[PDB]
PDB file of C-alpha atoms and ligand atoms in Angstrom:
ATOM      1  CA  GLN A   1     107.286  68.700 102.316  1.00 46.95           C
ATOM      2  CA  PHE A   2     105.088  69.928 105.333  1.00 50.24           C
ATOM      3  CA  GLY A   3     101.453  69.753 106.643  1.00 50.30           C
ATOM      4  CA  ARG A   4      99.083  72.121 107.560  1.00 49.96           C
ATOM      5  CA  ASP A   5      96.127  72.488 109.501  1.00 50.57           C
ATOM      6  CA  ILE A   6      92.471  73.294 108.749  1.00 52.04           C
ATOM      7  CA  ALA A   7      93.180  77.544 109.463  1.00 55.47           C
ATOM      8  CA  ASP A   8      96.269  77.053 106.891  1.00 54.24           C
ATOM      9  CA  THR A   9      98.830  77.176 110.220  1.00 53.95           C
ATOM     10  CA  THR A  10     101.999  74.857 109.418  1.00 55.54           C
ATOM     11  CA  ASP A  11     101.206  71.365 111.019  1.00 53.71           C
ATOM     12  CA  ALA A  12     103.982  68.851 110.504  1.00 53.70           C
ATOM     13  CA  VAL A  13     107.167  68.670 108.430  1.00 53.13           C
ATOM     14  CA  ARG A  14     109.621  65.528 106.796  1.00 56.48           C
ATOM     15  CA  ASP A  15     113.275  66.305 108.359  1.00 59.20           C
ATOM     16  CA  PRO A  16     115.611  67.674 105.359  1.00 62.02           C
ATOM     17  CA  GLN A  17     117.945  64.815 106.563  1.00 59.68           C
ATOM     18  CA  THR A  18     115.183  61.700 107.191  1.00 59.95           C
ATOM     19  CA  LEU A  19     112.203  61.431 105.388  1.00 57.27           C
ATOM     20  CA  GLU A  20     110.355  60.724 108.577  1.00 62.24           C
ATOM     21  CA  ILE A  21     107.474  62.648 109.394  1.00 61.53           C
ATOM     22  CA  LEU A  22     107.178  65.079 112.781  1.00 60.63           C
ATOM     23  CA  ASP A  23     104.389  66.888 113.794  1.00 62.64           C
ATOM     24  CA  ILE A  24     104.551  70.784 115.239  1.00 65.68           C
ATOM     25  CA  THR A  25     102.609  71.190 118.314  1.00 66.02           C
ATOM     26  CA  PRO A  26     103.038  74.681 119.730  1.00 64.72           C
ATOM     27  CA  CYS A  27     104.523  75.228 123.029  1.00 67.15           C
ATOM     28  CA  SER A  28     102.347  75.409 126.219  1.00 66.84           C
ATOM     29  CA  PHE A  29     100.796  78.803 127.058  1.00 67.28           C
ATOM     30  CA  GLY A  30      97.731  80.426 128.780  1.00 69.03           C
ATOM     31  CA  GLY A  31      96.608  83.295 130.934  1.00 64.04           C
ATOM     32  CA  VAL A  32      97.640  83.693 134.173  1.00 63.93           C
ATOM     33  CA  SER A  33      94.843  84.603 136.560  1.00 65.09           C
ATOM     34  CA  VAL A  34      95.301  85.504 140.286  1.00 66.42           C
ATOM     35  CA  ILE A  35      92.398  84.019 143.075  1.00 63.71           C
ATOM     36  CA  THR A  36      92.811  86.943 145.704  1.00 64.45           C
ATOM     37  CA  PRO A  37      90.620  87.387 148.910  1.00 63.29           C
ATOM     38  CA  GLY A  38      90.444  91.258 149.253  1.00 65.79           C
ATOM     39  CA  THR A  39      93.831  92.875 150.291  1.00 71.51           C
ATOM     40  CA  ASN A  40      91.378  94.216 153.412  1.00 69.11           C
ATOM     41  CA  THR A  41      91.445  90.467 154.333  1.00 67.56           C
ATOM     42  CA  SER A  42      94.743  88.559 153.444  1.00 69.05           C
ATOM     43  CA  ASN A  43      97.867  89.137 151.483  1.00 69.47           C
ATOM     44  CA  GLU A  44      97.777  85.553 150.545  1.00 67.71           C
ATOM     45  CA  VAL A  45      96.782  84.614 146.753  1.00 67.01           C
ATOM     46  CA  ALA A  46      96.662  81.600 144.459  1.00 61.98           C
ATOM     47  CA  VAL A  47      97.419  81.078 140.624  1.00 59.35           C
ATOM     48  CA  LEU A  48      95.429  79.619 137.855  1.00 54.48           C
TER      49      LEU A  48
ATOM     50  CA  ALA B   1      86.819  62.765  67.450  1.00 55.72           C
ATOM     51  CA  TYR B   2      85.472  64.048  70.480  1.00 54.09           C
ATOM     52  CA  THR B   3      84.455  62.592  74.099  1.00 54.38           C
ATOM     53  CA  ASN B   4      83.413  63.951  77.595  1.00 51.80           C
ATOM     54  CA  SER B   5      86.443  64.333  80.289  1.00 50.51           C
ATOM     55  CA  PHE B   6      83.771  63.672  82.927  1.00 55.83           C
ATOM     56  CA  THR B   7      85.398  64.998  86.426  1.00 55.72           C
ATOM     57  CA  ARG B   8      89.144  63.783  85.672  1.00 56.89           C
ATOM     58  CA  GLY B   9      92.571  65.883  85.274  1.00 57.27           C
ATOM     59  CA  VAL B  10      92.695  67.123  89.042  1.00 58.56           C
ATOM     60  CA  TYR B  11      96.191  66.898  90.282  1.00 56.56           C
ATOM     61  CA  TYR B  12      97.922  67.620  93.878  1.00 56.82           C
ATOM     62  CA  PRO B  13      98.320  71.658  93.440  1.00 54.77           C
ATOM     63  CA  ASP B  14     101.190  72.093  95.811  1.00 53.42           C
ATOM     64  CA  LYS B  15     103.811  70.442  98.094  1.00 54.23           C
ATOM     65  CA  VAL B  16     101.723  70.456 101.062  1.00 54.21           C
ATOM     66  CA  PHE B  17      99.741  67.321 102.834  1.00 53.67           C
ATOM     67  CA  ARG B  18      96.368  68.616 104.247  1.00 50.86           C
ATOM     68  CA  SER B  19      93.480  65.968 105.694  1.00 48.37           C
ATOM     69  CA  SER B  20      90.090  66.064 106.627  1.00 47.47           C
ATOM     70  CA  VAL B  21      89.756  69.705 105.189  1.00 48.26           C
ATOM     71  CA  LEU B  22      88.099  71.249 101.777  1.00 47.98           C
ATOM     72  CA  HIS B  23      90.718  73.334 100.346  1.00 49.24           C
ATOM     73  CA  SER B  24      90.205  76.361  97.610  1.00 50.65           C
ATOM     74  CA  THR B  25      92.952  76.851  95.024  1.00 52.80           C
ATOM     75  CA  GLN B  26      93.363  78.588  91.557  1.00 54.74           C
ATOM     76  CA  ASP B  27      95.187  77.127  89.129  1.00 57.51           C
ATOM     77  CA  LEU B  28      95.311  75.389  85.597  1.00 58.35           C
ATOM     78  CA  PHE B  29      93.192  72.458  85.794  1.00 59.77           C
ATOM     79  CA  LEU B  30      91.396  70.484  83.087  1.00 56.59           C
ATOM     80  CA  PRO B  31      87.821  72.390  83.625  1.00 54.95           C
ATOM     81  CA  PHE B  32      85.010  69.537  84.359  1.00 58.14           C
ATOM     82  CA  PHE B  33      83.073  68.316  81.249  1.00 57.61           C
ATOM     83  CA  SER B  34      84.983  69.625  78.615  1.00 58.36           C
ATOM     84  CA  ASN B  35      85.343  68.319  75.133  1.00 55.91           C
ATOM     85  CA  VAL B  36      88.649  66.113  74.784  1.00 58.30           C
ATOM     86  CA  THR B  37      90.152  65.544  71.177  1.00 57.59           C
ATOM     87  CA  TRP B  38      90.359  61.601  70.942  1.00 54.93           C
ATOM     88  CA  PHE B  39      92.737  60.108  68.347  1.00 56.80           C
ATOM     89  CA  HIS B  40      94.002  55.738  68.055  1.00 57.15           C
TER      90      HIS B  40
ATOM     91  CA  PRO C   1      66.901  62.899 134.768  1.00 54.19           C
ATOM     92  CA  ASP C   2      67.960  59.038 134.109  1.00 52.88           C
ATOM     93  CA  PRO C   3      70.421  57.960 136.800  1.00 48.65           C
ATOM     94  CA  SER C   4      71.588  54.788 134.632  1.00 51.10           C
ATOM     95  CA  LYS C   5      73.910  57.513 132.531  1.00 56.33           C
ATOM     96  CA  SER C   6      75.857  63.287 132.272  1.00 57.01           C
ATOM     97  CA  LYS C   7      72.602  62.626 134.178  1.00 57.58           C
ATOM     98  CA  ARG C   8      70.557  64.138 131.451  1.00 55.75           C
ATOM     99  CA  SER C   9      67.096  63.073 130.748  1.00 56.85           C
ATOM    100  CA  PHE C  10      66.367  61.387 127.531  1.00 53.53           C
ATOM    101  CA  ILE C  11      64.790  64.665 125.427  1.00 51.17           C
ATOM    102  CA  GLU C  12      67.688  66.417 127.177  1.00 52.47           C
ATOM    103  CA  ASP C  13      70.074  63.745 125.385  1.00 53.62           C
ATOM    104  CA  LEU C  14      68.540  64.317 122.083  1.00 53.29           C
ATOM    105  CA  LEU C  15      68.778  67.788 122.385  1.00 50.77           C
ATOM    106  CA  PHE C  16      72.671  67.255 122.874  1.00 49.83           C
ATOM    107  CA  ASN C  17      73.221  64.557 120.263  1.00 50.24           C
ATOM    108  CA  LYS C  18      71.777  67.296 117.394  1.00 49.01           C
ATOM    109  CA  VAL C  19      74.360  70.036 118.033  1.00 47.38           C
ATOM    110  CA  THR C  20      77.674  70.252 117.196  1.00 49.26           C
ATOM    111  CA  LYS C  21      92.590  77.930 117.381  1.00 50.00           C
ATOM    112  CA  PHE C  22      96.316  78.367 119.241  1.00 45.72           C
TER     113      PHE C  22
HETATM  114  C1  NAG D   1     122.393  62.754 105.155  1.00 46.01           C
HETATM  115  O1  NAG D   1     123.509  62.674 105.841  1.00 46.01           O
HETATM  116  C2  NAG D   1     123.693  62.133 107.241  1.00 46.01           C
HETATM  117  C3  NAG D   1     124.859  62.459 107.545  1.00 46.01           C
HETATM  118  O2  NAG D   1     125.313  63.890 108.317  1.00 46.01           O
HETATM  119  C4  NAG D   1     123.113  60.932 107.265  1.00 46.01           C
HETATM  120  O3  NAG D   1     122.542  60.199 108.516  1.00 46.01           O
HETATM  121  C5  NAG D   1     121.778  61.036 106.105  1.00 46.01           C
HETATM  122  O4  NAG D   1     121.392  59.672 106.043  1.00 46.01           O
HETATM  123  C6  NAG D   1     121.877  61.333 104.819  1.00 46.01           C
HETATM  124  N1  NAG D   1     120.367  61.733 104.411  1.00 46.01           N
HETATM  125  C7  NAG D   1     120.352  61.385 102.980  1.00 46.01           C
HETATM  126  C8  NAG D   1     118.927  60.816 102.664  1.00 46.01           C
HETATM  127  O5  NAG D   1     121.212  61.284 102.431  1.00 46.01           O
HETATM  128  C1  NAG D   2      89.226  96.814 156.031  1.00 43.85           C
HETATM  129  O1  NAG D   2      88.592  97.793 155.358  1.00 43.85           O
HETATM  130  C2  NAG D   2      87.575  98.809 156.755  1.00 43.85           C
HETATM  131  C3  NAG D   2      87.154  99.702 156.077  1.00 43.85           C
HETATM  132  O2  NAG D   2      86.243  99.181 154.812  1.00 43.85           O
HETATM  133  C4  NAG D   2      88.907  99.197 157.778  1.00 43.85           C
HETATM  134  O3  NAG D   2      87.919  99.940 158.618  1.00 43.85           O
HETATM  135  C5  NAG D   2      89.355  97.988 158.101  1.00 43.85           C
HETATM  136  O4  NAG D   2      90.247  99.049 158.928  1.00 43.85           O
HETATM  137  C6  NAG D   2      90.218  97.270 157.121  1.00 43.85           C
HETATM  138  N1  NAG D   2      91.053  96.348 157.658  1.00 43.85           N
HETATM  139  C7  NAG D   2      92.160  95.450 157.511  1.00 43.85           C
HETATM  140  C8  NAG D   2      92.936  94.787 158.390  1.00 43.85           C
HETATM  141  O5  NAG D   2      93.105  96.525 156.384  1.00 43.85           O
HETATM  142  C1  NAG D   3      81.935  69.235  72.270  1.00 44.66           C
HETATM  143  O1  NAG D   3      82.206  69.621  70.924  1.00 44.66           O
HETATM  144  C2  NAG D   3      80.663  68.979  69.820  1.00 44.66           C
HETATM  145  C3  NAG D   3      80.791  69.742  68.384  1.00 44.66           C
HETATM  146  O2  NAG D   3      81.772  69.212  67.965  1.00 44.66           O
HETATM  147  C4  NAG D   3      79.565  70.150  70.795  1.00 44.66           C
HETATM  148  O3  NAG D   3      78.438  69.570  69.948  1.00 44.66           O
HETATM  149  C5  NAG D   3      79.253  69.638  72.428  1.00 44.66           C
HETATM  150  O4  NAG D   3      78.630  70.636  72.946  1.00 44.66           O
HETATM  151  C6  NAG D   3      80.743  70.075  72.716  1.00 44.66           C
HETATM  152  N1  NAG D   3      80.765  69.818  74.060  1.00 44.66           N
HETATM  153  C7  NAG D   3      81.189  70.619  75.185  1.00 44.66           C
HETATM  154  C8  NAG D   3      81.095  70.031  76.643  1.00 44.66           C
HETATM  155  O5  NAG D   3      81.406  71.648  75.177  1.00 44.66           O
END
């Protein structure tokens, strides 16, 4: 029915209505880091 | 009569695909090198 | 360092080849 990763998380499935095999990549996520000069210098910032 | 099973009698234990991995599972299996009554 | 190569030396490359979530 379904595939699992090395850590036993779900990784792929058959579609219940068609025997084609589809993978499940996690949706994109990550930290937001604010690169800033000191607020004594400027109120400009850049975001990583 | 009797015979050695060797390493036989493994089967896919669940409806799950896995690849490039070593997975440890507890189930009914033919224990390795077990005596297997032989008939004809 | 070897300039033809990642500009590591020869031994400094063997040291890399000898060594090896969402
Ligand atoms: C299931 O029904 C759909 C129509 O809703 C059809 O397209 C699909 O091929 C059917 N699948 C099977 C394997 O019966
Ligand atoms: C920056 O900080 C110093 C004290 O460290 C202060 O005297 C100065 O007025 C500050 N300048 C601005 C533009 O905030
Ligand atoms: C199988 O049975 C025979 C006796 O019939 C015994 O000598 C032998 O050790 C047994 N083999 C195993 C693997 O237990």
